[PDB]
């Protein structure tokens, strides 16, 4: 049902809260944006699974074991041979986080005015695709953009928009399809690998290139093992060299599910490609030998990849988020269903049914969470979905959402009833969030720095 | 109610999760005796709470500043400084544990053939007191003989056993008073301010000196904060504070409420027996400066001794035992009450009450426990009671007991539930548990190394 | 003289101690290419200065302090604080490393078709600035380019040939002046504070900008305080402080000279840049609160920039590096004279004078550096020079160098004279070293993987 | 001739020094004594090499893997394992240090009137002896005593003087014969191995077991290897392996050469004697299966005493000592000789040729060497020696000593030449030292706490 830990606590960090007079000031103080508040305010800090993970005593032990030589540590072999068995990929080029692979992959595979199809977009992912001259289309299936909709898999890529875009575009314009496991937007639902079966026989009959967004791919290796007939004997390690046998490459955060607070890498069989990516590393993260990483930091990740195969381990991160979801949606709470491997997300537009989306109401939402609870979460709905670049509206994204992000390995049960117990009492008044508006909007990824005001 | 956990998780300890049938051969081959499993064969291991705390990440910043010099480390004015402000002695010398100031202190402060009264005893403490001619008399209140007995306070002295005493015996023959905060022999079970000042001004008035076993001296500070009436606007540093002012002295383990895995100390507010500790100190662990620790070591038990007095910390320290001890009792279970600050105690006697004591319950009660639960508990009954040294029989304990010992800051409310829930279904069953009987008997400490199998 | 280390080894790095005839048969196995050679077959290893540093026992407390907030992290406050401190730039952000400051800082100070203008260039800094539309112009007095002249601060800019620019380009169409501390192709020589006033005056009265390259600038420092007249009663703070009030902004890699194994960051006194800085940084690295850096390594960044600042320290850095180029100068082995700050220049085309360049002299003197004493050297000549693209053709640089650059605080002055009795015995024989020919040669950074073997 | 040190700086600690002025007010602050100064005062720091070591980055990973179970920690298999397979003993009972191991082995071997004999004798060791009733007898060679005397093995036990100590006091009379390598108060002399074969076969046939102490058994195992005829091709491991199988059992202070900061055991073949042992190793340190130290200390021994058996570690240790005699020496500063594996010894008779033992110049040597250097050294004379029992006179060694103690892998060469550049020149006005008498001395151990003032 809801397993214990499959650990020990091995070393703690203490945590405190300011009282609601000072955090409606730290929120005044930020511009009621979650990403300008100070860390030390923060009890419960579920801004971002993404390089928040508690490490193990084993990749502790590889931390005093950095070797920082400039070329050919034993760290980059360490995870270059991890990286090879598990994923199955001929070449490894780390980075120094996902973003870094991100930008090569871009620069590497995409000719200006070709097409990337995903399923769904991310923000940085999509960025580096249009900077680079590619045009996004969205492939995943329609239910993937219903919140209330609880159905498996929704990640999956709609097969018939593919071949649709196969069609209408031309194989060749295609520069490559970009395969999320699992998608992030979508509230961290996973791909079957039914799915990414029949991606990889279509793309294959064309010669279009497939390479996967790999962050969350235990997550997702999890949700196969669960859920997909035929795949309840198989190890978590099987189904995720299973899953990468389907693609061409793969770029990587290990921020999430290597367990570590820092690094990412670039996987990919062609040769050709292989001798181009080294070329580019040295510009943008440095020598292929450690790739803007330093040596403790690569070993962290090949011993912190392994950890996450564990069945256990992965059981009780997926299970400890539904436990929250459970918990939220006994008591009406409107979330995201089904919910993701990673985060509990909150819908905003059924939590705040007298707000409009002009006036950015998960925006408000998260900064009510925190005055009324001292959590921090992540606005996800218009904001982050940035402005059309050619009319210069905002993207209006059906999934205005609040994202209650769980790090690995960081917090218990007894901090998940906090989190439900405090946002079930702010639910009882809903009625009392304000809308804002824009006074500083950057060009560019705005909702990281961007500063409202209340309406 | 039971709080959350005042700190986040830091890092952790793997455990590998082996299922029962394996956790069955274990236990074979540890001869049913859980002072014999290996600690990676263990998820849960409640053995003792000595030893076994996680540190935080401020101790651990600590563990990388070690002044490891002979003489005059900073370390150590560290440690000197800490104790002096937060337990008000004048005078302070470093152990490696607390066995190791009792042994100074035996040796410094008893004359062949004086008495030592005390509320119950420890078995090291008591060694050292009878090994240097005293004889023990033991003054603690009636109640705490009774297991079953729920009232406060139950570790507080008699003082008219202890009036009785010195006007029987006499105060020049009296060494000391020996008050242990808490007390373990029954429990964990609390000691009152008021009768830490009642014993103060009795012995004065006699010239009897008050030394106190400090070992759990926070958790008996939050039961006077709790449960004593006028504490409740004291901060806990304030309670231990004014504890120790009713004391000339104490041997501390930081072992218990230090938060750390090895270390103690001994304290003194007399010039001349400071002088001649420093003299014997050199004899069995090292100098003043060090006392048988690294310098790391005496870092990490000052800033673990600021830190037990968070109250956060030591409220949640207390209700998560407490929680435990609540749900057995909420199910039947029989355990000892109240339940102390650190441990809960199975009453094996009555949970196994188709078992004589010959056929061991409380040592086969804890093999059917990590059987079930993969937890590790330790007997407390006619096994660890030892043989008579002249007879040749056994000594036959009164309790008859599984200590559930918990360790600080390691195990969560979901690990308590484990506990909980194999336990509850082993009663529901109890009639199937078997006796032991000795297959391998060592001369001594034979709870150590003792082999049995079922009858 | 020749100080003493002012520290004491706190931990050290064991390595193998393997005989010449292993070493020879590793050389081999590598090509003959020491980028080829593993780190755990290595003594010493002086391919680099760049975070290969060792960290002191106060970093490694810091590093376990790391707060791994997404956003607010107390380590980069700390971070903040420090540089703004020792450098006194209005604005901070933070990157995984140097080159990702740098190209941030193109991207937002070019437009395309200015021109750039330097004290000589690096090659991740000059691709940044082409890559942006920009054309490089040397500015470096012409003394820099005479490896035997020894004269005090050779990486002074010509401030004449920087008027000359202005005049014939006009400053509209100037992007900004990169001033590098120290001059990395000059062998590592400083820049006189006389020479970066200078500098300002000319260019503040044509609006145009100055940004400096502060890689290694405590070394330059040091070099002021003990070679330019006025500054001897001046701290190394004092003279840092100062010299970046000439400047507008910095791209600093804190993988030299701030003591680490990974970090670095971008300063700015504008606040519209500042601004766009902040923009553009989530797209490369992450939050301007993080950067592509775990929190722990911002920790150690701001303790070893502070750390860097101590005269001892920088001291003891510079004449470890000039002890060694002193003991082979003293021997007649020709080497680039000033010595610099971070390493010491063999001259290979001199070295091995009867080998041409096609013969590949620098890379075939490192192999038999490593050979006779388990020293790993970096060969900067015509193997890392490369190919010209259209051509096909051996770029054929002046300087046919062996680079031995030495990490701070991880050698003594007994690895130096490993280092140089070594390399003296090489050179009485050196007529026996014998030329290098391809047998395997990647497309590009060919330096980095191709083999070898003797002709 | 002196090798570079076989290893690589991982991590360092700064120093400093205190002006002359304060460094003579804190000489007054601590009464003349070394051991009552202050370590942050102390440049470099050779009070002693006893738990001051610099552990490398495999024992630091093994920190951060502390299994701190009571019992079957994963730590206390590895260290076991390796002492049994290193040393060949059959039994092994951890303890927090070696006179925690004495302590035990003095209560077990020694009946109230025997004699206990060795090479010399040590202040802790001889303690425990006498504290439990025996009679300790010198049986080393008389040119042990001499300190100019040059020759080798100086260790060794006088055949004839235990051949006489059987006859006139009978074997049975003797407890046993304590054999130390190497001899700590002859200077660090080593002891041969055909002399540990010649002890083994004349107790064996008389029945008198005899018990090593191995605190620097490999700086001993490398002179054998050095300067034995036989022993060259040895390897360090074989030698001490050999050394152990003449001796019955050893205690052991893992703080010299097992390269910890804390940590020793006490090993035996004997089953009964192993028996007894775990009964009392429970009153004074532990339980048998941690023994008084935290898991991670445990680790941290059993990869250190791997890591001494490396021939080159041990031979640059030894020959690192050596070169600050060989320096001395070369100036005409009076020492022991030959000088031994851990420490060079002043000869304060020699250097104070107008001071008197009674007026104690050792201790006042040392006083005047941190005064003008700022290094600290430990008197090694008549103040070490103690009072004798039955008379109450001092105990007047021959050997007045000032003992420069070099911790393992902690200061270089450049700090040596430092520590003999400082004493040459104190050599040059050595009439200004004053001698000293008492003021306050303790029971027993004196050296350790007590004041002195000027005469
Ligand atoms: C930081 C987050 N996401 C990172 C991310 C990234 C970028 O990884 P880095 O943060 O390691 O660049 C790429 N792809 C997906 C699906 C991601 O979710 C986040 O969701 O908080
Ligand atoms: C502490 C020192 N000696 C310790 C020592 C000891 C005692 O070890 P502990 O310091 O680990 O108790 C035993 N035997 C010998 C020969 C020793 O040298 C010292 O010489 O500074
Ligand atoms: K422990
Ligand atoms: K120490
Ligand atoms: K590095
Ligand atoms: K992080």
Redesign the interface.
């Known amino acids: 049902n809801?397993?214990?830990?499959?650990?020990?606590?091995?070393?703690?960090?203490?945590?405190s809260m300011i009282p609601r007079d000072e955090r409606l000031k730290k929120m005044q103080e930020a511009g009621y944006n979650?990403?300008?508040?100070?860390?030390?305010?923060?009890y419960?800090?579920l801004?971002?699974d993404?390089?928040?993970?508690?490490?193990?005593?084993?990749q502790?032990?590889?931390?005093?074991?950095?070797?920082?030589?400039?070329?050919?540590?034993?760290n980059f072999?360490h995870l270059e041979r991890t990286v090879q068995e598990l994923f199955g990929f001929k070449h490894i080029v780390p980075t120094?986080?996902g973003?870094?692979a991100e930008?090569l992959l871009s620069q590497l595979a995409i000719k200006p005015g070709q097409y990337v199809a995903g399923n769904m977009y991310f923000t940085?992912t999509r960025?580096?695709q249009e900077?680079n001259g590619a045009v996004f289309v969205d492939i995943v299936r329609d239910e993937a953009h219903d919140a209330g909709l609880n159905i498996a898999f929704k990640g999956d890529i709609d097969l018939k928009k593919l071949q649709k875009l196969i069609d209408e575009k031309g194989a060749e314009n295609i520069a490559y399809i970009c395969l999320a496991v699992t998608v992030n937007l979508a509230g961290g639902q996973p791909v079957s690998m039914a799915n990414m079966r029949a991606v990889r026989e279509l793309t294959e009959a064309h010669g279009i290139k497939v390479f996967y967004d790999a962050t969350r791919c235990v997550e997702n290796a999890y949700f196969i093992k669960e859920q997909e007939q035929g795949f309840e004997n198989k190890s978590i390690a099987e189904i995720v060299h299973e899953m990468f046998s389907y693609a061409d490459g793969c770029t990587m955060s290990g921020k999430k599910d290597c367990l570590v607070?820092?690094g990412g890498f670039l996987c990919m069989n062609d040769d050709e490609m292989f001798?181009?990516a080294?070329?580019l590393v040295?510009?943008?993260?440095?020598?292929?030998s450690?790739g803007?990483?330093?040596?403790?930091?690569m070993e962290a990740m090949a011993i912190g990849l392994r950890?996450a195969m564990?069945y256990?381990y992965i059981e009780h991160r997926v299970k400890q988020v539904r436990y929250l979801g459970d918990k939220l949606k006994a008591a009406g709470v409107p979330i995201v269903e089904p919910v993701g491997g990673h985060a509990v997300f909150l819908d905003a537009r059924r939590f705040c049914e007298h707000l409009t989306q002009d006036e950015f109401p998960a925006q408000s939402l998260a900064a009510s969470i925190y005055v009324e609870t001292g959590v921090r979460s992540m606005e996800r709905g218009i904001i982050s979905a940035g402005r059309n670049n050619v009319t210069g509206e905002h993207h209006r994204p059906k999934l205005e959402t609040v994202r209650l992000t769980i790090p690995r390995?960081?917090?218990?049960?007894?901090?998940m009833?906090?989190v439900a117990d405090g946002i079930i009492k702010l639910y009882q008044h809903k009625e009392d969030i304000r809308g804002l508006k824009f006074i500083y909007e950057?060009?560019?990824?705005r909702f990281?720095?961007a500063r409202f005001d209340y309406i």
């Not at 809801?2 to 945590?15: D, G, L, N, Q």
């Not at 502790?60 to 034993?74: P, R």
């Open positions: 809801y397993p214990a830990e499959p650990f020990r606590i091995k070393s703690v960090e203490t945590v979650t990403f300008l508040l100070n860390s030390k305010d923060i419960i800090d801004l971002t993404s390089g928040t993970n508690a490490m193990s005593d084993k502790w032990a590889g931390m005093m074991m950095g070797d920082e030589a400039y070329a050919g540590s034993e072999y120094h986080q973003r870094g930008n940085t960025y580096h900077k607070n820092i001798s181009s080294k070329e040295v510009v943008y993260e440095g020598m292929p450690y803007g990483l330093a040596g403790r930091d950890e564990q256990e390995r960081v917090y218990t049960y007894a901090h009833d906090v950057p060009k560019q990824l990281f720095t």
